[PDB]
């Protein structure tokens, strides 16, 4: 087929937390280093293309998307947590409930809650460094496409699409897709589209660009009435101000198969075609998989070949940022199938 380059960090376990709050218990996290190891091993076994390590871009490009206070918090959170004498990993306990003030406090517990949307995303040693590397993985891929590649695969871990300008959660810290999209904008690309095919709503990407018409954000996902993130992702969220009609949410119910999901994909592709962007960022999750342990769609591994083919037909410079997908048995087959279908396999 064709060839696609993949950017990856060799330190798969830089982020290495051991707890995630789930169903009232502290379990082993779903977003585990073996996710990245397994995808990388399938990239190599399939000879998808060249594999390279990220360039360091520093925090400059990260701060085009995230606030300075938030970027500082994530760097110091673990140290401050340990210094306050807590014995577990860093998990929020308290937050800005409805009727309370969106006011940044001093105490580390208060700041953890202020900056989070969920308690599923433990922070420990290495988390800051891992988030930085994953952002650099996305920016290296963006650089590859800007300098001539049709597409590149940013093997991001941790993922990013739930991260707001200053809110972390859903296993995400820095919004890698939004950082790559904004990097395209900063490099003179007039219009960028961000298409979120992870099972969950990309609420962070929607929020970051919500009042802007230069970045079109679209997400297909399970009904937030039923699943995370619960409080964004509904189809009536179409943008605000100049961003009115430049956000599109497409929602599906439990057990949705490719035959139906692909109708939503076609709707998203039509919206992209009318927008006529200059580059495309695909926030790629394969938690739409029929065996994914926390999601309820029914795509088969062969469906990811079809997804990649349909994405290529859009005809755009394309960066893929890796998001979710938690059946590690099949994560490599599924994610690399998208790249292979984009490159002509099917």
Ligand X SMILES: NCCCNCCCCCB(O)O
Residue ranges for the known binding site for Mg(2+) are 107, 109, 291, 327, 329
Residue 198 lies near Zn ion (rule: CB under 5 A): yes
Rounded-to-integer distance, Cα 150 and Cα 152, Å: 7
Residue 249 lies near K ion (rule: CB under 5 A): no
Rounded-to-integer distance, Cα 258 and Cα 332, Å: 19
143-182 residues near its own copies, rule: CB under 8 A: 164-167, 169
Piece of 130-138, 214-222, 259-267, 335-343 that binds K ion (CB under 5 A):
214-222
The gap between the terminal CA atoms of the chain, to the nearest Å, is 10
* Residues ≥6 apart with Cβ < 8 Å to 71: 59, 62, 63
Which residue among 45, 107, 242, 244 contacts Mg ion (CB under 5 A)? 107
Which residue among 29, 160, 277, 324 contacts ligand X (CB under 6 A)? 324
For ligand X, the closer CB: 89 or 120: 120
The token duo for 323 is: 């998001």
DSSP state of 150: S
The token duo for 153 is: 């695969």
Rounded-to-integer distance, Cα 31 and Cα 43, Å: 19
Q: How far is the CB of 116 from its own copies (least distance, A)?
A: 7
Residue 171 lies near ligand X (rule: CB under 6 A): yes
The binding site for Zn(2+) comprises 198, 200, 287
Piece of 229-237, 257-265, 277-285, 313-321 that binds its own copies (CB under 8 A):
229-237
The Cβ of residue 42 has, within 10 Å, a number of other Cβ atoms equal to: 20
The token duo for 180 is: 């790559």
Residue 294 lies near its own copies (rule: CB under 8 A): no
Separation in Å, CA 27 to CA 37, 128, 329: 21, 22, 19
In DSSP notation, 322-342 reads E-----HHHHHHHHHHHHHHH
**Catalytic residue list contains 162:** yes
Rounded-to-integer distance, Cα 57 and Cα 122, Å: 26
Q: Which of Zn ion, Mg ion, ligand X, none interacts with 291 (beta carbon under 5 to 8 A by kind)? A: Mg ion
Count of all residues that appear for the chain in the document:
346
Q: Which of Zn ion, its own copies, Mg ion, none interacts with 200 (beta carbon under 5 to 8 A by kind)? A: Zn ion
Residue 113 lies near its own copies (rule: CB under 8 A): yes
Residue 209 lies near K ion (rule: CB under 5 A): yes
Contact mark string toward ligand X, 12..51, x via CB under 6 A = ----------x-------x---------------------
Is 320 in contact with 145 (CB distance < 8 Å)? no
Q: Where do the H-state alpha helices sit in 158-313? A: 176-186, 203-208, 258-275, 301-313
Binding site for Zn ion (CB under 5 A): 198-200, 285, 287, 324
Binding site for ligand X (CB under 6 A): 22, 30, 120, 159, 161-162, 170-171, 198, 200, 228, 285, 287, 294, 323-324
Binding site for K ion (CB under 5 A): 196, 198, 209, 212, 217, 219, 221, 243, 246-247
Q: So which residues are the catalytic ones?
A: 162
């Amino acid at each position: 087929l064709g060839s696609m380059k993949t950017v990856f960090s060799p330190l798969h376990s830089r982020r290495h937390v051991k707890t995630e709050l789930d169903g009232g218990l502290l379990i082993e996290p779903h977003e585990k280093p073996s996710r990245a190891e397994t995808i990388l091993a399938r990239v190599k076994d399939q000879a998808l293309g060249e594999i390279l390590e990220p360039e360091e871009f520093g925090l400059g490009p990260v701060k085009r998307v995230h606030t300075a206070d938030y970027v500082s918090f994530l760097e110091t959170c673990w140290d401050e947590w340990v210094a306050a004498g807590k014995r577990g990993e860093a998990i929020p306990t308290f937050w800005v409930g409805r009727g309370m003030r969106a006011r940044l406090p001093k105490d580390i517990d208060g700041r953890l809650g202020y900056y989070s949307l969920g308690a599923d995303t433990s922070i420990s040693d290495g988390t800051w460094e891992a988030a930085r590397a994953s952002a650099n993985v996305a920016l290296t891929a963006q650089k590859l496409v800007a300098e001539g590649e049709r597409a590149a695969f940013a093997l991001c871990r941790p993922p990013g699409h739930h991260a707001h300008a200053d809110v972390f959660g859903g296993y995400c810290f820095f919004n890698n897709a939004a950082i790559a999209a904004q990097a395209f904008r900063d490099q003179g690309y007039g219009k960028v589209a961000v298409l979120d095919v992870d099972f969950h709503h990309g609420n962070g990407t929607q929020a970051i660009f919500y009042d802007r018409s230069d970045v079109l954000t679209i997400s297909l996902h399970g009904d937030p009435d039923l699943v995370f993130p619960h409080f964004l992702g509904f189809e009536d969220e179409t943008g605000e101000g100049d961003g009115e009609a430049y956000n599109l949410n497409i929602v599906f119910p439990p057990d949705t198969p490719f035959s139906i999901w692909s109708q939503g994909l076609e709707k998203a592709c039509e919206r992209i075609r009318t927008f006529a962007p200059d580059a495309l960022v695909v926030a790629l999750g394969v938690d739409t998989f029929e065996e994914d342990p926390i999601s309820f769609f029914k795509l088969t591994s062969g469906d990811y070949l079809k997804l990649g083919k349909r994405l290529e037909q859009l005809g755009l410079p394309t960066v893929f940022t890796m998001e979710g997908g938690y059946d590690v048995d099949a994560i490599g087959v599924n994610a690399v199938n998208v790249m292979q279908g984009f490159e002509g396999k099917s």
